Short mmCIF file of C-alpha atoms and ligand atoms in Angstrom, two decimals:
data_model
loop_
_atom_site.label_atom_id
_atom_site.label_comp_id
_atom_site.label_asym_id
_atom_site.label_seq_id
_atom_site.Cartn_x
_atom_site.Cartn_y
_atom_site.Cartn_z
CA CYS A 10 -12.84 -84.25 -149.60
CA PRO A 11 -11.38 -86.54 -146.86
CA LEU A 12 -9.94 -89.13 -149.26
CA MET A 13 -7.36 -88.17 -151.89
CA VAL A 14 -5.04 -90.39 -153.97
CA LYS A 15 -1.77 -89.22 -155.57
CA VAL A 16 0.21 -91.38 -158.00
CA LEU A 17 3.72 -90.68 -159.39
CA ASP A 18 5.74 -92.40 -162.12
CA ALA A 19 9.29 -93.13 -160.81
CA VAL A 20 10.60 -93.96 -164.31
CA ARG A 21 9.65 -90.76 -166.13
CA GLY A 22 9.74 -88.57 -163.02
CA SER A 23 6.23 -87.28 -163.55
CA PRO A 24 2.69 -87.59 -162.24
CA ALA A 25 0.99 -90.87 -163.21
CA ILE A 26 -1.92 -89.56 -165.28
CA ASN A 27 -5.22 -91.30 -166.08
CA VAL A 28 -4.74 -94.11 -163.56
CA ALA A 29 -7.99 -95.86 -162.60
CA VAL A 30 -8.67 -96.13 -158.83
CA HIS A 31 -11.41 -98.19 -157.14
CA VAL A 32 -12.38 -97.91 -153.48
CA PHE A 33 -14.26 -100.58 -151.51
CA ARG A 34 -15.59 -100.82 -147.95
CA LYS A 35 -15.78 -104.09 -146.02
CA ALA A 36 -19.36 -105.18 -145.34
CA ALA A 37 -20.72 -106.92 -142.23
CA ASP A 38 -20.63 -110.21 -144.14
CA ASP A 39 -16.97 -109.34 -144.85
CA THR A 40 -17.47 -108.77 -148.57
CA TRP A 41 -15.93 -105.79 -150.36
CA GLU A 42 -18.71 -103.43 -151.39
CA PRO A 43 -17.90 -100.85 -154.10
CA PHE A 44 -17.57 -97.42 -152.45
CA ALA A 45 -16.24 -94.99 -155.07
CA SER A 46 -13.91 -94.78 -158.07
CA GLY A 47 -12.27 -92.39 -160.52
CA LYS A 48 -9.07 -91.61 -162.48
CA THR A 49 -5.96 -89.53 -161.65
CA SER A 50 -5.65 -86.07 -163.26
CA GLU A 51 -2.77 -84.45 -165.18
CA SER A 52 -1.15 -83.72 -161.80
CA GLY A 53 -1.50 -87.39 -160.80
CA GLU A 54 -4.18 -86.58 -158.19
CA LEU A 55 -7.68 -87.98 -157.61
CA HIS A 56 -10.02 -85.79 -155.56
CA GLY A 57 -13.78 -85.90 -155.02
CA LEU A 58 -14.00 -89.62 -154.37
CA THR A 59 -16.20 -89.17 -151.29
CA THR A 60 -17.58 -86.85 -148.60
CA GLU A 61 -17.27 -86.52 -144.82
CA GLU A 62 -20.83 -87.82 -144.36
CA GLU A 63 -20.37 -90.81 -146.66
CA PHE A 64 -16.84 -91.65 -145.45
CA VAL A 65 -17.88 -93.39 -142.23
CA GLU A 66 -15.82 -95.67 -139.98
CA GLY A 67 -14.81 -98.88 -141.66
CA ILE A 68 -12.08 -100.88 -143.32
CA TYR A 69 -11.39 -99.54 -146.82
CA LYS A 70 -9.52 -100.88 -149.82
CA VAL A 71 -8.07 -98.51 -152.43
CA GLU A 72 -7.14 -100.50 -155.52
CA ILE A 73 -4.92 -98.62 -158.01
CA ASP A 74 -4.80 -100.07 -161.55
CA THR A 75 -1.04 -99.83 -162.11
CA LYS A 76 -1.09 -102.70 -164.65
CA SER A 77 -3.12 -100.84 -167.26
CA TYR A 78 -0.91 -97.78 -166.64
CA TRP A 79 2.31 -99.63 -167.50
CA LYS A 80 0.78 -101.66 -170.33
CA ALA A 81 -0.42 -98.49 -172.07
CA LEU A 82 3.26 -97.41 -171.97
CA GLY A 83 4.44 -100.65 -173.56
CA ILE A 84 5.68 -102.19 -170.32
CA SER A 85 4.64 -105.52 -168.79
CA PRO A 86 4.61 -104.81 -165.01
CA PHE A 87 4.93 -107.25 -162.13
CA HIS A 88 1.91 -106.21 -160.04
CA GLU A 89 -1.73 -106.58 -161.11
CA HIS A 90 -2.33 -103.39 -159.12
CA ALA A 91 -1.35 -101.53 -155.93
CA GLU A 92 -3.99 -102.00 -153.15
CA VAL A 93 -4.02 -100.17 -149.79
CA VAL A 94 -6.22 -101.58 -147.01
CA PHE A 95 -6.78 -99.58 -143.81
CA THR A 96 -9.22 -98.75 -141.04
CA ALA A 97 -10.48 -95.19 -141.30
CA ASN A 98 -12.11 -92.71 -138.93
CA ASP A 99 -11.98 -94.95 -135.88
CA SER A 100 -10.85 -92.07 -133.64
CA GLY A 101 -13.06 -89.53 -135.37
CA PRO A 102 -12.97 -88.15 -138.95
CA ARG A 103 -9.55 -87.68 -140.54
CA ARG A 104 -8.25 -86.55 -143.91
CA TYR A 105 -6.31 -89.18 -145.85
CA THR A 106 -3.92 -88.77 -148.75
CA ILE A 107 -2.78 -92.08 -150.21
CA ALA A 108 0.41 -91.54 -152.22
CA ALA A 109 1.70 -94.25 -154.55
CA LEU A 110 5.13 -94.13 -156.20
CA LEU A 111 5.21 -96.51 -159.19
CA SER A 112 7.86 -98.46 -161.10
CA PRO A 113 7.43 -101.57 -163.29
CA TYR A 114 8.62 -104.02 -160.60
CA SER A 115 8.12 -101.96 -157.45
CA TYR A 116 5.82 -99.52 -155.74
CA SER A 117 5.71 -97.63 -152.46
CA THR A 118 2.60 -96.37 -150.77
CA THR A 119 2.50 -93.67 -148.10
CA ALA A 120 -0.41 -92.33 -146.10
CA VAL A 121 -0.42 -88.71 -144.94
CA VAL A 122 -3.23 -88.49 -142.39
CA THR A 123 -4.24 -85.13 -140.96
CA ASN A 124 -6.94 -84.02 -138.53
CA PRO A 125 -9.43 -81.79 -140.39
CA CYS B 10 12.50 -122.44 -154.26
CA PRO B 11 10.34 -120.57 -156.76
CA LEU B 12 8.84 -118.13 -154.28
CA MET B 13 10.58 -116.31 -151.44
CA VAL B 14 9.50 -113.37 -149.29
CA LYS B 15 11.81 -110.97 -147.44
CA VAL B 16 10.59 -108.28 -145.05
CA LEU B 17 12.65 -105.42 -143.55
CA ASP B 18 11.91 -102.95 -140.72
CA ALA B 19 12.76 -99.34 -141.72
CA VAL B 20 12.24 -97.98 -138.18
CA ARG B 21 14.80 -100.18 -136.43
CA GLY B 22 16.90 -101.01 -139.49
CA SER B 23 16.70 -104.76 -139.18
CA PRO B 24 14.93 -107.76 -140.66
CA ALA B 25 11.24 -107.94 -139.73
CA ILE B 26 11.00 -111.17 -137.74
CA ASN B 27 7.98 -113.46 -137.19
CA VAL B 28 5.79 -111.65 -139.68
CA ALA B 29 2.79 -113.77 -140.81
CA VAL B 30 2.58 -114.32 -144.56
CA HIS B 31 -0.22 -116.03 -146.49
CA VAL B 32 -0.23 -116.79 -150.21
CA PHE B 33 -3.46 -117.31 -152.17
CA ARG B 34 -4.17 -118.44 -155.73
CA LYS B 35 -7.12 -116.94 -157.62
CA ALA B 36 -9.74 -119.58 -158.42
CA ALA B 37 -11.94 -119.86 -161.53
CA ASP B 38 -14.74 -118.13 -159.62
CA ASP B 39 -12.33 -115.26 -158.84
CA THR B 40 -12.17 -116.06 -155.12
CA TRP B 41 -8.81 -116.39 -153.34
CA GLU B 42 -7.98 -119.98 -152.43
CA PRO B 43 -5.31 -120.45 -149.72
CA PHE B 44 -2.11 -121.71 -151.34
CA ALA B 45 0.77 -121.47 -148.84
CA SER B 46 1.83 -119.55 -145.72
CA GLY B 47 4.35 -119.18 -142.90
CA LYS B 48 6.26 -116.65 -140.79
CA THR B 49 9.51 -114.74 -141.43
CA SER B 50 12.74 -116.00 -139.87
CA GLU B 51 15.34 -114.23 -137.67
CA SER B 52 16.73 -112.92 -141.04
CA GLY B 53 13.31 -111.65 -142.16
CA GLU B 54 13.04 -114.32 -144.85
CA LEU B 55 10.40 -116.91 -145.67
CA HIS B 56 11.39 -119.74 -148.04
CA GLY B 57 9.90 -123.12 -148.94
CA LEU B 58 6.43 -121.78 -149.62
CA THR B 59 5.99 -123.92 -152.72
CA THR B 60 7.73 -126.09 -155.31
CA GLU B 61 8.30 -125.45 -159.02
CA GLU B 62 5.91 -128.32 -159.63
CA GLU B 63 3.05 -126.80 -157.60
CA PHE B 64 3.66 -123.15 -158.54
CA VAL B 65 1.78 -123.05 -161.84
CA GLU B 66 0.98 -119.94 -163.88
CA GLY B 67 -1.83 -117.95 -162.33
CA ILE B 68 -2.67 -114.90 -160.22
CA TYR B 69 -1.18 -115.03 -156.73
CA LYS B 70 -1.81 -112.84 -153.70
CA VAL B 71 0.85 -112.48 -151.01
CA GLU B 72 -0.68 -111.02 -147.83
CA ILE B 73 1.84 -109.83 -145.21
CA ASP B 74 0.42 -109.12 -141.76
CA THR B 75 2.17 -105.81 -141.17
CA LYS B 76 -0.46 -104.67 -138.62
CA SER B 77 0.23 -107.46 -136.12
CA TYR B 78 3.95 -106.82 -136.59
CA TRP B 79 3.73 -103.14 -135.58
CA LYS B 80 1.14 -103.73 -132.85
CA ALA B 81 3.48 -106.22 -131.15
CA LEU B 82 6.16 -103.51 -131.27
CA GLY B 83 3.67 -101.14 -129.67
CA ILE B 84 3.73 -98.91 -132.75
CA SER B 85 0.48 -97.71 -134.35
CA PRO B 86 0.34 -98.86 -138.00
CA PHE B 87 -1.77 -97.51 -140.86
CA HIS B 88 -2.31 -100.54 -143.11
CA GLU B 89 -4.29 -103.65 -142.20
CA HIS B 90 -1.65 -105.63 -144.10
CA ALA B 91 0.51 -105.41 -147.23
CA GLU B 92 -0.94 -107.21 -150.27
CA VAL B 93 1.16 -108.05 -153.32
CA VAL B 94 -0.88 -109.37 -156.26
CA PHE B 95 0.86 -110.69 -159.41
CA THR B 96 0.66 -113.16 -162.30
CA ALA B 97 3.22 -115.99 -162.24
CA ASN B 98 4.60 -116.50 -165.76
CA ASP B 99 6.75 -119.20 -167.39
CA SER B 100 7.92 -116.86 -170.18
CA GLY B 101 9.83 -114.81 -167.63
CA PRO B 102 12.42 -115.83 -164.99
CA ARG B 103 11.74 -118.75 -162.63
CA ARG B 104 12.56 -117.50 -159.11
CA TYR B 105 10.50 -114.77 -157.45
CA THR B 106 11.65 -112.77 -154.45
CA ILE B 107 9.07 -110.40 -152.99
CA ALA B 108 10.82 -107.86 -150.80
CA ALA B 109 8.78 -105.60 -148.51
CA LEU B 110 10.30 -102.58 -146.76
CA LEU B 111 8.10 -101.63 -143.80
CA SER B 112 7.37 -98.39 -141.95
CA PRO B 113 4.28 -97.71 -139.75
CA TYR B 114 2.62 -95.47 -142.35
CA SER B 115 4.38 -96.61 -145.49
CA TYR B 116 5.65 -99.73 -147.25
CA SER B 117 7.40 -100.68 -150.48
CA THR B 118 7.32 -103.96 -152.32
CA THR B 119 9.77 -104.96 -155.03
CA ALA B 120 10.01 -108.12 -157.10
CA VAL B 121 13.40 -109.56 -158.07
CA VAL B 122 12.62 -112.16 -160.73
CA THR B 123 15.66 -114.25 -161.66
CA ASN B 124 16.05 -117.53 -163.54
CA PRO B 125 18.71 -119.12 -161.28
CA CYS C 10 32.31 -108.49 -143.55
CA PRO C 11 31.28 -105.34 -141.71
CA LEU C 12 30.04 -103.46 -144.75
CA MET C 13 28.00 -104.78 -147.66
CA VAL C 14 26.10 -103.01 -150.42
CA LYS C 15 23.16 -104.43 -152.41
CA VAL C 16 21.57 -102.68 -155.38
CA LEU C 17 18.29 -103.63 -157.12
CA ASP C 18 16.74 -102.47 -160.43
CA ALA C 19 13.03 -101.57 -160.02
CA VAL C 20 12.45 -101.20 -163.79
CA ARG C 21 13.52 -104.71 -164.78
CA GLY C 22 12.99 -106.36 -161.40
CA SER C 23 16.46 -107.78 -161.04
CA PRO C 24 19.73 -107.15 -159.25
CA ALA C 25 21.60 -104.10 -160.55
CA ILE C 26 24.83 -105.59 -161.92
CA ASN C 27 28.25 -103.93 -162.40
CA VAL C 28 27.30 -100.77 -160.55
CA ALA C 29 30.35 -98.76 -159.41
CA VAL C 30 30.50 -98.10 -155.67
CA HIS C 31 33.01 -95.94 -153.80
CA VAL C 32 33.27 -95.56 -150.03
CA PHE C 33 34.91 -92.53 -148.40
CA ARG C 34 35.80 -91.70 -144.81
CA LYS C 35 35.52 -88.10 -143.58
CA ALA C 36 38.93 -86.69 -142.62
CA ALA C 37 39.77 -84.27 -139.79
CA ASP C 38 39.67 -81.41 -142.31
CA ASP C 39 36.15 -82.54 -143.31
CA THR C 40 37.23 -83.69 -146.77
CA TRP C 41 36.27 -87.15 -148.06
CA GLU C 42 39.22 -89.54 -148.18
CA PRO C 43 38.80 -92.62 -150.43
CA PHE C 44 38.35 -95.69 -148.24
CA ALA C 45 37.17 -98.62 -150.39
CA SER C 46 35.36 -99.36 -153.67
CA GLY C 47 34.27 -101.98 -156.18
CA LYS C 48 31.42 -103.04 -158.49
CA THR C 49 28.23 -105.04 -157.83
CA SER C 50 28.14 -108.73 -158.75
CA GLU C 51 25.68 -110.73 -160.92
CA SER C 52 23.51 -110.81 -157.71
CA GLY C 53 23.73 -107.03 -157.25
CA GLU C 54 25.92 -107.39 -154.17
CA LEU C 55 29.29 -105.94 -153.19
CA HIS C 56 31.11 -107.55 -150.24
CA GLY C 57 34.67 -107.44 -148.92
CA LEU C 58 34.90 -103.67 -148.90
CA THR C 59 36.63 -103.57 -145.54
CA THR C 60 37.51 -105.54 -142.41
CA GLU C 61 36.26 -105.10 -138.83
CA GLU C 62 39.79 -104.03 -137.99
CA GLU C 63 39.92 -101.23 -140.58
CA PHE C 64 36.28 -100.10 -140.28
CA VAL C 65 36.62 -97.78 -137.29
CA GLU C 66 33.95 -95.41 -135.97
CA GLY C 67 33.58 -92.36 -138.18
CA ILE C 68 31.47 -90.75 -140.90
CA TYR C 69 31.34 -92.78 -144.11
CA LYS C 70 30.01 -91.88 -147.54
CA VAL C 71 28.85 -94.61 -149.92
CA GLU C 72 28.59 -93.22 -153.47
CA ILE C 73 26.74 -95.48 -155.95
CA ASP C 74 27.12 -94.56 -159.62
CA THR C 75 23.47 -94.87 -160.60
CA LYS C 76 23.90 -92.53 -163.61
CA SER C 77 26.39 -94.75 -165.45
CA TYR C 78 24.14 -97.71 -164.67
CA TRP C 79 21.06 -96.19 -166.37
CA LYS C 80 23.04 -94.63 -169.23
CA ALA C 81 24.44 -98.06 -170.15
CA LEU C 82 20.85 -99.32 -170.22
CA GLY C 83 20.00 -96.42 -172.51
CA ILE C 84 17.62 -94.99 -169.91
CA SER C 85 17.78 -91.29 -168.96
CA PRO C 86 18.43 -90.97 -165.20
CA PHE C 87 17.82 -88.00 -162.90
CA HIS C 88 20.49 -88.35 -160.21
CA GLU C 89 24.24 -88.02 -160.75
CA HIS C 90 24.63 -90.84 -158.22
CA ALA C 91 23.13 -92.10 -154.95
CA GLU C 92 25.02 -90.98 -151.83
CA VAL C 93 24.49 -92.64 -148.45
CA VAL C 94 26.21 -90.82 -145.57
CA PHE C 95 26.27 -92.33 -142.06
CA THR C 96 28.22 -92.63 -138.80
CA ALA C 97 29.65 -96.09 -138.04
CA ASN C 98 29.09 -96.88 -134.35
CA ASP C 99 30.38 -99.61 -132.00
CA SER C 100 27.45 -99.17 -129.58
CA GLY C 101 25.08 -100.51 -132.22
CA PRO C 102 25.18 -103.73 -134.30
CA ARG C 103 28.36 -104.76 -136.15
CA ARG C 104 27.30 -105.63 -139.72
CA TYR C 105 25.95 -102.97 -142.09
CA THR C 106 24.01 -103.74 -145.25
CA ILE C 107 23.20 -100.73 -147.42
CA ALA C 108 20.42 -101.65 -149.81
CA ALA C 109 19.55 -99.33 -152.70
CA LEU C 110 16.41 -99.77 -154.79
CA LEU C 111 16.86 -97.96 -158.11
CA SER C 112 14.50 -96.32 -160.61
CA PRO C 113 15.49 -93.69 -163.24
CA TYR C 114 13.91 -90.81 -161.31
CA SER C 115 13.79 -92.27 -157.83
CA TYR C 116 15.82 -94.36 -155.38
CA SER C 117 15.53 -95.71 -151.86
CA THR C 118 18.28 -96.65 -149.46
CA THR C 119 17.79 -98.74 -146.34
CA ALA C 120 20.26 -99.87 -143.71
CA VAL C 121 19.96 -103.31 -142.11
CA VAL C 122 22.31 -103.18 -139.12
CA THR C 123 22.75 -106.59 -137.47
CA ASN C 124 25.29 -107.94 -134.98
CA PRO C 125 25.82 -111.38 -136.58
CA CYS D 10 9.76 -71.06 -158.12
CA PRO D 11 11.50 -73.81 -160.20
CA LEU D 12 12.90 -75.72 -157.21
CA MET D 13 10.62 -77.14 -154.52
CA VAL D 14 11.34 -79.73 -151.81
CA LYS D 15 8.68 -81.88 -150.08
CA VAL D 16 9.47 -84.08 -147.08
CA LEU D 17 7.16 -86.67 -145.44
CA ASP D 18 7.50 -88.68 -142.22
CA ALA D 19 6.75 -92.39 -142.94
CA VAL D 20 6.52 -93.26 -139.23
CA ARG D 21 3.86 -90.76 -138.16
CA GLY D 22 2.23 -90.51 -141.58
CA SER D 23 2.54 -86.75 -141.71
CA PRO D 24 4.52 -83.96 -143.35
CA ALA D 25 8.06 -83.61 -141.99
CA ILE D 26 7.92 -80.09 -140.56
CA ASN D 27 10.81 -77.71 -139.85
CA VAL D 28 13.41 -79.76 -141.73
CA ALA D 29 16.49 -77.75 -142.72
CA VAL D 30 17.48 -77.96 -146.43
CA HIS D 31 20.70 -76.66 -148.02
CA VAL D 32 21.31 -76.36 -151.76
CA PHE D 33 24.74 -76.14 -153.40
CA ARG D 34 25.95 -75.71 -156.98
CA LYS D 35 29.18 -77.24 -158.29
CA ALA D 36 31.79 -74.61 -159.17
CA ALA D 37 34.29 -74.69 -162.05
CA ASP D 38 36.96 -75.76 -159.56
CA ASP D 39 34.52 -78.54 -158.60
CA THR D 40 33.78 -77.18 -155.14
CA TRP D 41 30.25 -76.99 -153.75
CA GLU D 42 29.23 -73.36 -153.52
CA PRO D 43 26.26 -72.52 -151.25
CA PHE D 44 23.24 -71.71 -153.46
CA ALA D 45 20.19 -71.42 -151.19
CA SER D 46 18.64 -72.86 -148.03
CA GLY D 47 15.50 -72.89 -145.89
CA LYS D 48 13.18 -75.06 -143.75
CA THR D 49 10.07 -77.14 -144.58
CA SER D 50 6.66 -75.71 -143.61
CA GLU D 51 3.73 -77.25 -141.70
CA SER D 52 2.78 -79.02 -144.95
CA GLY D 53 6.32 -80.41 -145.29
CA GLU D 54 7.07 -78.16 -148.29
CA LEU D 55 9.91 -75.72 -149.01
CA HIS D 56 9.21 -73.11 -151.69
CA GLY D 57 11.00 -69.89 -152.63
CA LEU D 58 14.50 -71.35 -152.60
CA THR D 59 15.41 -69.77 -155.95
CA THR D 60 14.26 -68.08 -159.17
CA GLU D 61 14.27 -68.92 -162.88
CA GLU D 62 17.03 -66.36 -163.50
CA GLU D 63 19.23 -67.57 -160.65
CA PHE D 64 18.60 -71.29 -161.27
CA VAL D 65 20.98 -71.67 -164.21
CA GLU D 66 22.38 -74.86 -165.74
CA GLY D 67 24.60 -76.77 -163.39
CA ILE D 68 25.02 -79.72 -161.09
CA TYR D 69 23.10 -79.14 -157.84
CA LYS D 70 23.14 -80.81 -154.44
CA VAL D 71 20.09 -80.65 -152.16
CA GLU D 72 21.10 -81.72 -148.67
CA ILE D 73 18.17 -82.47 -146.33
CA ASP D 74 18.99 -82.52 -142.59
CA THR D 75 17.08 -85.67 -141.65
CA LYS D 76 19.37 -86.34 -138.65
CA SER D 77 18.29 -83.28 -136.68
CA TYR D 78 14.67 -84.11 -137.59
CA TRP D 79 14.82 -87.59 -136.04
CA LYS D 80 16.97 -86.53 -133.07
CA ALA D 81 14.45 -83.84 -132.11
CA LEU D 82 11.90 -86.70 -131.97
CA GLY D 83 14.09 -88.79 -129.68
CA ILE D 84 15.31 -91.13 -132.42
CA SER D 85 18.91 -91.85 -133.42
CA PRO D 86 18.73 -92.23 -137.23
CA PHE D 87 21.11 -94.05 -139.56
CA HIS D 88 21.74 -91.31 -142.15
CA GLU D 89 23.53 -88.01 -141.46
CA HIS D 90 21.17 -86.54 -144.06
CA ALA D 91 19.46 -87.24 -147.40
CA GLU D 92 21.35 -85.59 -150.34
CA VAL D 93 20.12 -85.43 -153.96
CA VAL D 94 22.66 -84.55 -156.67
CA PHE D 95 21.49 -83.83 -160.23
CA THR D 96 22.14 -81.82 -163.36
CA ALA D 97 19.48 -79.19 -163.92
CA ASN D 98 18.25 -77.15 -166.88
CA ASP D 99 20.54 -78.75 -169.43
CA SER D 100 17.74 -78.99 -172.01
CA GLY D 101 16.24 -75.66 -171.05
CA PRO D 102 14.54 -74.51 -167.80
CA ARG D 103 12.45 -77.08 -165.93
CA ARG D 104 10.48 -77.15 -162.71
CA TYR D 105 11.77 -79.60 -160.10
CA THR D 106 10.02 -81.04 -157.07
CA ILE D 107 12.31 -83.15 -154.90
CA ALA D 108 10.21 -85.40 -152.66
CA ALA D 109 11.79 -87.23 -149.73
CA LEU D 110 10.00 -89.94 -147.75
CA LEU D 111 11.75 -90.43 -144.39
CA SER D 112 12.10 -93.25 -141.85
CA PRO D 113 14.82 -93.73 -139.18
CA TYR D 114 16.79 -96.30 -141.22
CA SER D 115 15.55 -95.59 -144.73
CA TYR D 116 14.56 -92.85 -147.12
CA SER D 117 13.31 -92.59 -150.68
CA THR D 118 13.74 -89.60 -152.93
CA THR D 119 11.68 -88.90 -156.04
CA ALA D 120 11.98 -86.12 -158.59
CA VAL D 121 8.89 -84.85 -160.39
CA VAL D 122 10.21 -82.71 -163.24
CA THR D 123 7.82 -80.69 -165.38
CA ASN D 124 8.29 -78.28 -168.27
CA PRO D 125 7.16 -74.79 -167.16
O1 TBP E 1 3.04 -84.90 -152.89
C1 TBP E 1 3.64 -86.04 -152.55
C2 TBP E 1 4.76 -86.45 -153.39
BR1 TBP E 1 5.41 -85.32 -154.70
C3 TBP E 1 5.44 -87.65 -152.93
C4 TBP E 1 4.93 -88.45 -151.90
BR2 TBP E 1 5.84 -90.01 -151.48
C5 TBP E 1 3.78 -88.04 -151.33
C6 TBP E 1 3.11 -86.99 -151.61
BR3 TBP E 1 1.60 -86.31 -150.69
O1 TBP E 2 17.84 -108.49 -149.75
C1 TBP E 2 17.08 -107.47 -150.17
C2 TBP E 2 17.16 -106.13 -149.66
BR1 TBP E 2 18.26 -106.02 -148.13
C3 TBP E 2 16.37 -105.24 -150.11
C4 TBP E 2 15.49 -105.36 -151.12
BR2 TBP E 2 14.38 -104.02 -151.76
C5 TBP E 2 15.44 -106.60 -151.76
C6 TBP E 2 16.31 -107.70 -151.39
BR3 TBP E 2 16.27 -109.38 -152.17
#
């Protein structure tokens, strides 16, 4: 499990539960091919998106559906979503944790990258 | 006047200067059509991207080239760029200020939507 | 001129107005002596706290009353206030801008130290 | 273990290891009495600071020594430290996780509060 996503709600001070997350990988023809997807758990975490074998070198895009999250709570947010784009495993396989801290008009994203 | 971008450097504690910024508008076929662009000033600001007249309601993508910024500084970044996607709306305030706080492995983006 | 404070509201996406701010200077006996104070403007800014002449090198504490801000909005905050402690230094740039991005259960503070 | 602290380095994209953390509780005479302290682990986490019985209602101050952290890395940071002040357990016992995202000239602090 080399790719993990963690989302927190900065308004309620709690994990952001049931947030949809889509991952894409840039193709040779520079198109974004669907790679994996899922939803955050009660702890705001999304594990099991991919494997070490599948998670090859490449440029990935993790798109977090923050809009649906805020709308379900009765809030009209600014962003359509929070999307992280990055090159992965270009110096060998690494473990990535993409953390997103959400607010209606602001979000922060941090990457904690460790060598397995 | 209606759209401004401000970028700060959290490592050196100063405005992020000469950062490339491109704005796109989502087309009917869901592809991103180039709309406006430029580079941040000595104060880390980028104004005059569009006019009230040209900035119609729609989905806009603001792509900030954070990677080139850090690479020039000789610092190894994580993200390929910082992308801020949002829907421009007449119902809400007129002026949009997209502020991005940058760090090599983390970034935050906040919108300050005001009428005046 | 040498010290400015800017506060933003990440929930409503606007400047945080009428936020109480107090600045203290650490005394020889390590107690915090009141130095300057005021409230944020309609633009979420607070200028004219001190002069270059009065702002000598030393340890300063900037206490932002985030709790009263959220309570007035009828939103339950976590923090009692946001405290930014730092050492003013002549070796580095002259002007200090303390920016605080507020959310009920989270806040960020960045310093933009520039000479001009 | 109702009080946990987590610190991440936004420059390296890794946990902030060996960061000293001091906790204080406001006394009746409004002085800050030392409550507990420790250092972050290899995962950037600090557990075992207190217990449910000891962690009574009160106003607490968690002071994170970010200055020593950056100085050890050859960087002269802006903040003397990152200090969170908050009222705890005023609506019954809760579990608190204080997360701090660090950068030389900026830091964010988030509180994830759950009902045990
Ligand atoms: O566990 C984490 C929390 Br809580 C906050 C941030 Br930011 C990142 C991670 Br990983
Ligand atoms: O001027 C700004 C600062 Br400094 C920080 C953030 Br966040 C937004 C604005 Br506008």
